[PDB]
A paper describes a structure:
Here we present a series of TIGR03971 SDR crystal structures from several mycobacterial species which contain an insertion in the primary sequence at the NAD cofactor binding site. These crystal structures demonstrate that the inserted protein residues almost completely cover the NAD cofactor, only leaving part of the nicotinamide ring exposed to solvent. NMR experiments did not show exchange of the NAD cofactor, whereas binding was demonstrated for a number of small molecules which could be potential substrates, products, inhibitors, or artificial redox partners. Experimental results are consistent with the notion that the SDR family enzymes linked by comparative genomics studies to mycofactocin do indeed keep their NAD tightly bound beneath a protein structure that may interact with a specialized adaptor machinery for redox exchange.
With the exception of the M. thermoresistibile target which did not contain NAD, all other mycobacterial SDR target crystal structures contained NAD, which appears to have co-purified with the protein after expression in E. coli. In contrast, this loop is ordered in each of the mycobacterial SDR crystal structures presented here.
Residue numbers in the entry:
A (entry chain C): 20 to 59, 62 to 295
B (entry chain D): 20 to 60, 62 to 295
C (entry chain A): 20 to 295
D (entry chain B): 20 to 59, 62 to 237, 241 to 295
Amino acid sequence: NRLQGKVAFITGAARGQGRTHAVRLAQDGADIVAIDLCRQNLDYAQGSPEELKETVRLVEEQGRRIIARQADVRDLASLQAVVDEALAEFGHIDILVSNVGISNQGEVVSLTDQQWSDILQTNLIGAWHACRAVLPSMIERGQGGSVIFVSSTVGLRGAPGQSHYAASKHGVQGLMLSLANEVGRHNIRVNSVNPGAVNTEMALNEKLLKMFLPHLENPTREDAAELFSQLTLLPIPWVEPEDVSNAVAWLASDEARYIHGAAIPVDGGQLARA
Amino acid sequence: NRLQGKVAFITGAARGQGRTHAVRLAQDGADIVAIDLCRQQNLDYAQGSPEELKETVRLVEEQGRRIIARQADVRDLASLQAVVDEALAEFGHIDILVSNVGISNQGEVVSLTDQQWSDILQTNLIGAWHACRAVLPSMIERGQGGSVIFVSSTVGLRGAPGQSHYAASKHGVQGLMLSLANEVGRHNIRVNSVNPGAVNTEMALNEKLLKMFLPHLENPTREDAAELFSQLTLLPIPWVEPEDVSNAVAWLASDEARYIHGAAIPVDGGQLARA
Amino acid sequence: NRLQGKVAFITGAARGQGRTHAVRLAQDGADIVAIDLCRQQPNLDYAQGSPEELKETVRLVEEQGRRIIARQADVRDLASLQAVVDEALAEFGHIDILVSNVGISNQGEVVSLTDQQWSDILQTNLIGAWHACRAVLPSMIERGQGGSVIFVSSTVGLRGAPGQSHYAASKHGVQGLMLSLANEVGRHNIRVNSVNPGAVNTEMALNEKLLKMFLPHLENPTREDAAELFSQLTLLPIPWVEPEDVSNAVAWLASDEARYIHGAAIPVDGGQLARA
Amino acid sequence: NRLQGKVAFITGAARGQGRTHAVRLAQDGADIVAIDLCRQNLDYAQGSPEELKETVRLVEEQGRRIIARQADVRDLASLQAVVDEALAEFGHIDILVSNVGISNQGEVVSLTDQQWSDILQTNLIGAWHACRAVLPSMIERGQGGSVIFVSSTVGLRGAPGQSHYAASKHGVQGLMLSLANEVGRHNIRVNSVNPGAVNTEMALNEKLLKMFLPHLTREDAAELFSQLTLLPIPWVEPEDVSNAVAWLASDEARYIHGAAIPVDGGQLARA
Ligand code: NA
Ligand code: NA
Ligand code: NA
Ligand code: NA
């Protein structure tokens, strides 16, 4: 197991991308600390308690140990509570996966204070909170570790109709680079993965599709494939959550021990498109 | 007279960088709408006062320009809308928006507080968006294009240990900049950032900030500051001046720069290029 | 009069972007050293600089009230450039601003490009740019007044370009040269930057052979067909920038207004690089 | 065995970075086509025919096949001859590792025409030659593939005293991005790995160290270079670069395209 004896803390783990992170790192021998708000302003399906229970089953199916808790990344104390439990049961946290957050839509002149507040609190402040909660024990344990920020192509380019979301993931990259300069010295590697279109309910939701395809009354998954296929260079409409999780699992492994300060696009060429 | 007939809306205009924006654009013919909070805040440097805003007004009127200056809070959309409405009533149009510097304070990732993150984002990122929200509808409707210049920082393009919230906030401004550039380019509204490194201002050279970089020194001086920051620049300078930032702003606003769009221009004597 | 008293050395000055740089820096009060190969190269399918076109650049600069030394020269040949610099220095005493111009291009996919295309494009665009630096810089260091080096690059110095990988490699190379040079001569108060135009209104950027690559469904593409293509690439409502626009950026970088801009690559592209 | 059934063509494979790539891919089950000029203006030990035999020995010890040939990346025909032999023997080439090239020193005013010609010819034109030689079969087979340029942190930042080397590796990035746009549609993935200081003769030789430490060993190297990394290391190992290359060629990284991955312990991110 490439991650044998490691413990990975994963946010948004009830479903989607966060679930795939837990199973994939579990596959590599990592025990898991999993949190999700487990509650449904956002126009797609989010995690539930039943879905977190499935994440648990799936990780336990791989022969691993898991602590799964309802928690709120927007709330430091809520995270510290779970970190404290993990540490009492597992002794250490070696890998932090600050997963993907939330998004909704609108133009600069049309966005609301509520939309800015929500997106920053969840996507930026929440990523910082996970860091603030986990790093003290990681620094104290003295064995190094990994902080992987699950960001986005919109952390590295503009996104019309999504300026708040792009501002938030740009902010995550600023956090990442700043963190890399603080905790490098401790052998704590800090990197981002930057997916483009991904096969999830969050990335492919009808509301978002309508913004890009305002002429269509009910845009379908086929319509989405036709839109997003033009953005990738590879013959694909989007990557899978597993492709993002594979990158995360590699960064956490000794194979990638000296990778630090990187933003790795997982996008089939979107960011390289001429 | 490169900006004759234009009106520029400038934030943090009471002193320092914002003041120099106001004076420089006025020198080129722009009339001015200037706001500042005019309150000394959680920060460890001198900030703008009402008396300093009055002096900004004297300096602009001495260039033969018109100015509307008001106390306003960029953190509060309704407060900015009130000023924009007055400006549009008096001046008819706002052609240039300069979203100026914001605020900072210090701390490592593990030691920063919620208050620090909240405050820095609210002023530096939300505040910048509020100025855009407040100003763009009239600029779009007026139909003659215009300019949005975000005054950011080298830490919107690189990390800053001990300043992760600040760097996050300025990265966020770059993200806002690039997105807006895709939304309003079509209206011939040009959107760019200027990205100063170390600048000669009370905000960039304040003692608490200097002590972060120089923790062994008991009372780091301006001369200690020169010796530190000089190592960062490639040009033989300790830092740029506020005037150098304001020149870049005034160039972007002119017809000489009419098709520059989506650009982040470092005004840093080479800091970002340093090998 | 923002450049009064300055001497600008400009490559590829016969027509197109080179001419506009000469004229625009002249307008700002700089005297001009202008070089162009002045030969129609058969490996390039667009009108290039000719002696007659250099004579008209001379006429336009003198009409602004400026002096100009205009010479046929090959940037691919170090000795050729050193001879023009030595003449410049004998007549004017100093060279303050080096404008390393846009160079040349032709088309081909990675699997289809020839050794000749690679050798040609790098010789003129990259080695040539270094030649200009190699030849002008010793005097500019010795004289101890600082100066400006301004590379005229491209959006394809900052992104990939399908069908033009040698051209995009050459301008990426120019960026690497710029940044390295920035680290060497910064201490001398010599500022080093690039300007990076997108689609610009010249024969090099809009010639029919190039358009055909981009519009393979069109038998004989026109300037209208070019406008309709390139307009989709800019965020501003224009088909391309004008070479005057590139020159205004050059002229500003050379001025005291931009005295501390160093190590920058400024896109002049109506938002092409920022497009989502 | 992540690379089972694949054939990797590796340039500069006699020693150093090149050799570790061969062995690392062989470890993942790839067969290998290895070339090196095998010949000594460069102030460090370069590959020899004896070092190529040892690369063969180490790859064979993994139970793989290898075709190892003296060839010159500066000469397209020389490369086409080796590609044609590999195709006659293996039937296909799936992975191209355009590995690391050469360097020497000089400021912009002090470099020679010969210095620029040699560095561009080996580093940039050589890299293009490899692509030119390998891609037609790779496209025609219609199975996709991987092109991995071994580049440098100096393809992404400036390098005082090394402007020609930095120009060459910036150039590699341009070729990479351009190529990514041409052959993506064929499911041919194109990326770069960008190491900083690496533990090799080329990265660490005394002539180069002198340029960086003009007031003056390995220990001298490590004390200087340690300042550049954020992690507590003096440099990466060649094995670290080879690990990145091997991951990118695997199904684990199947959709990573147009990326430049720094392998530098934080050098590019340093504030
Ligand atoms: Na596609
Ligand atoms: Na300096
Ligand atoms: Na357009
Ligand atoms: Na280090």
